Amino acid sequence: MSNLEIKQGENKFYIGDDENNALAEITYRFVDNNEINIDHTGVSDELGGQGVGKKLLKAVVEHARENNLKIIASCSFAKHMLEKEDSYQDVYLGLEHHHHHH
């Protein structure tokens, strides 16, 4: 009953019953100063459309933008998702070989 909330933990946000029933969680740490990395993303993805990770990503990027935080990712899962998503291009650095006329 009324269980779609995000549990706030130590630099980690997880959605689930408990620590074991953490069906979707994301972690971020301050590697340098305002630069944060998505350390680990334990998000179960059923069919993509039911990927709770998007809700977590939204929250992290939203929070980061307002905090002037720069988001990188140590996990390829998160790294590649933000890579294709130019909607989060504010805090996402990425990588490019300067071949960007477009």
C-alpha span between 7 and 14 (Å, rounded) = 5
3-class SS at 80?
helix
CATH of domain 1-102: 3.40.630.30
Q: Considering Cα of 24, then 29, then 31, then 32, what sign does the dihedral take? A: positive
For the chain, the domains span: 1-102
Three-state DSSP class for residue 23 = strand
> What does DSSP say about strands 7-9 and 12-16: parallel, antiparallel, or unpaired?
antiparallel
Strand 70-73 and strand 35-43: pairing? parallel
